[PDB]
Design an enzyme around this catalytic site. Sequence first.
Site, mmCIF file in Angstrom:
data_model
loop_
_atom_site.group_PDB
_atom_site.id
_atom_site.type_symbol
_atom_site.label_atom_id
_atom_site.label_comp_id
_atom_site.label_asym_id
_atom_site.label_seq_id
_atom_site.Cartn_x
_atom_site.Cartn_y
_atom_site.Cartn_z
ATOM 1 N N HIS A 195 -5.285 5.728 7.883
ATOM 2 C CA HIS A 195 -4.822 6.731 8.186
ATOM 3 C C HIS A 195 -3.577 6.270 7.914
ATOM 4 O O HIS A 195 -2.801 7.425 7.292
ATOM 5 C CB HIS A 195 -5.084 7.159 10.020
ATOM 6 N N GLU A 228 0.727 6.017 0.496
ATOM 7 C CA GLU A 228 -0.385 6.288 0.624
ATOM 8 C C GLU A 228 0.368 8.095 -0.080
ATOM 9 O O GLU A 228 1.949 7.527 -0.829
ATOM 10 C CB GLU A 228 -0.504 7.494 2.323
ATOM 11 N N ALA A 229 -0.027 9.308 -0.523
ATOM 12 C CA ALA A 229 0.520 9.873 -1.480
ATOM 13 C C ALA A 229 -0.067 11.593 -0.534
ATOM 14 O O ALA A 229 -0.752 11.119 -0.094
ATOM 15 C CB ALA A 229 0.565 9.571 -3.214
ATOM 16 N N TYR A 277 -3.305 2.355 -9.669
ATOM 17 C CA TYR A 277 -3.074 3.078 -8.898
ATOM 18 C C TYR A 277 -1.096 2.968 -8.271
ATOM 19 O O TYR A 277 -0.175 3.694 -8.764
ATOM 20 C CB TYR A 277 -3.645 3.781 -7.598
ATOM 21 N N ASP A 293 0.770 -1.887 -0.292
ATOM 22 C CA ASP A 293 0.621 0.131 0.339
ATOM 23 C C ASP A 293 0.753 1.118 -0.217
ATOM 24 O O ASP A 293 2.002 1.197 0.687
ATOM 25 C CB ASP A 293 -0.628 0.000 1.288
HETATM 26 CA CA CA Z 1 -4.369 1.995 -1.058
#
Ligand code: CA
Lengths: 220, 215
Positions: free
Chosen positions: A181, A15-16, A122, A13
């Site tokens: 989060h 986050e960005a 993504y 995973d």
């Molecule tokens: Ca994701």
Amino acid sequence: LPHGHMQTLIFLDLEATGLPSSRPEVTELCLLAVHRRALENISQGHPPPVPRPPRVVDKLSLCIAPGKACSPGASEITGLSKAELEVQGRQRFDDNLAILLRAFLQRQPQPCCLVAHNGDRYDFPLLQTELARLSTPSPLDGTFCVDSIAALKALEQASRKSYSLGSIYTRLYWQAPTDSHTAEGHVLTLLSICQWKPQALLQWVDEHARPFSTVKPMYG
Amino acid sequence: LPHGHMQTLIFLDLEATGLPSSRPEVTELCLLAVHRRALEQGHPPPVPRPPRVVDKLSLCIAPGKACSPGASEITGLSKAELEVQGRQRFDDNLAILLRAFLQRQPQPCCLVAHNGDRYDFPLLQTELARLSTPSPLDGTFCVDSIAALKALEQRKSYSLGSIYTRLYWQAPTDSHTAEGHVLTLLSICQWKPQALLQWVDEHARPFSTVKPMYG
DNA sequence: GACG
DNA sequence: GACG
Ligand SMILES: [Ca+2]
Ligand SMILES: [Ca+2]
């Protein structure tokens, strides 16, 4: 079998700073590597309990300074900001980070397959973009990837639902995901849903896996 | 004072095949790196929140010898099963991994481990000496969280779970994995963060000076 | 002691 | 969609 049997599922995973059209930059990355056997090794109870993570797992989670600001929605969704990552002295996505990934991947039984929710649209493309900026070769040219959205669609259907991470999870276990989060929180939710039908999950992975090197960059 | 302000605290826990007198080997390793700014009431205080910004590493490791019966029970690890799931030993590539992780941290860095002076630090050194390449830790510092908390607490136990429960009035969350032990240690060190940092800066010593557990 |  |  396209490329044989994947001995390792690496749940991924990112986050960005934003969504794709914004040319986003990674701010946090989590990897959870699992031997396929850990994922074979029956649910009882109603509603079906959230499965135990396997005991034997490798885990890597890193915070990463982006070169641009976090969009407001990314920053709220992640609890991260560019200023904070710098304040806490995080470093950009660099060659060393690639060596770290390289060594981590090497520790796993080959062949390895990355698994990410909406990964084909993504995570994989953006991760491809990050590594391309780098003055070293990609540590994933031999690694494989599949998208878990296509995985659970072809699993539930085997028997108008959203296939977002949190939706599938609440469908399956009648609970809200523990952590929304952080990159690690996303990976653990991903792992639990992928544990719903481990047997069939694996079969589907082994047959739909494709070289990570064939993933096209998100942007140039 | 002695080595300047530590910029990164790395919380460390090792799972192993047994206690020191068994000449144990590592079966799991967890590192949790936190910048000092991440640190820098009441009665009881709630369990502190882990900082948002952390780096985390957790690896299972195939030992050269079997876990003692007791270590298998409390770790849920065995050599056989570690081998069944294809874990690699404590090897050269693991050292490369460790080194990269560490150089993503702002220096100087201080390892923090509970009873680390008697256990994790000497055990890690014994593990690292076994390899061909140079130790990725020879630039790093370390300190024991037991002394820290003896000092910060103003006769009772200073085991991990005992301090934790005396402080927050709760049992630790997870006593069965290296990551679990690290998180319990983190909460403990977040009780009086500035005082803790204070004490780490003053007592930080070179990990190059830690004597192997055996060998 | 306190660490597996 | 669905990912931040
Ligand atoms: Ca994701
Ligand atoms: Ca310990």
